[PDB]
Amino acid sequence: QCGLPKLMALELFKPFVMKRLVDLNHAQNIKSAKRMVERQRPQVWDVLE
Amino acid sequence: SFTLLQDQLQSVLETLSEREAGVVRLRFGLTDGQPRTLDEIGQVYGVTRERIRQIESKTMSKLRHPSRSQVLRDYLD
DNA sequence: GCTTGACAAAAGTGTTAAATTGTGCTATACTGGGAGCCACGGATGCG
DNA sequence: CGCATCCGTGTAAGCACAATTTAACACTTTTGTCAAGC
Structure with a gap:
């Protein structure tokens, strides 16, 4: 195991997070998911988990 | 995302309107x-x-409806 | 629901002016640049 | 045939005329627009 910072991990996994957000209807499309992630809304962290 | 537009804006709204969007193509x-x-x-x-002049305005009014309008809001900056 | 005719605006054809670019000419005499502030390996003459 | 030394190498155009390209203007055709009626 290794500990990875939230800010770093989010930027590395951005595309996976966007896909998962789109699937769970937190964002309407890819641009919406990317904009949501760039603002780092509270719902992004649960998806990243 | 542009290709996804070819999946949404180009396709689904056309399937539900027949020639009202077939002429738009x-x-x-x-x-x-x-x-x-x-x-x-x-x-x-x-x-x-x-008649086509009237049909274009009718289609524009039809697609201004919130149900169709809300979907495409994210594809325009 | 669809068509007819007058009307305003936008998109073509063509002429013309202008700006932009290319080529040629100038006959005192002048005639040969001027810069410039190393060590290593492979080969050939000599002993 | 081996060694010492030499070499190669990583300060000064401007004008005239002709030809091409680009814009400005004018009119004409086409497009979109409006009302009204068939």
Whole structure:
């Protein structure tokens, strides 16, 4: 195991997070998911988990 | 995302309107690539210039409806 | 629901002016640049 | 045939005329628009 910072991990996994957000209807499309992630809304962290 | 537009804006809204959007495919050249004037898309069939002029406004009003309008909001900056 | 005719605006044809670019000419005499502030390996003459 | 030394190498155009390209203007065709009626 290794500990990875939230800010770093989010930027590395951005595309996976966007896909998962789109699937769970937190964002309407890819641009919406990317904009949501760039603002780092509270719902992004649960998806990243 | 542009390709996803070819999946949404180009396709689904056309399936639910038949020729009301089939003419639009010729209007902006979604097929064969040529945007076409009212006469060109009308002269080959039995529909006049003014009728296509009315149909374009009717389609614009139809697609302004919130149910269709809300979906495409994210594809425009 | 669809068509007819007058009307305003936008898109073509063609002429013309202008700006932009290319080529040629100038006959006192002048005639040969001027810069400039190393060590290593492979080969050939000599002993 | 081996060694010492030499070499190669990583300060000064401007004008005239002709030809091409680009814009400005004018009119004409086409397009979209409006009302009204068939």
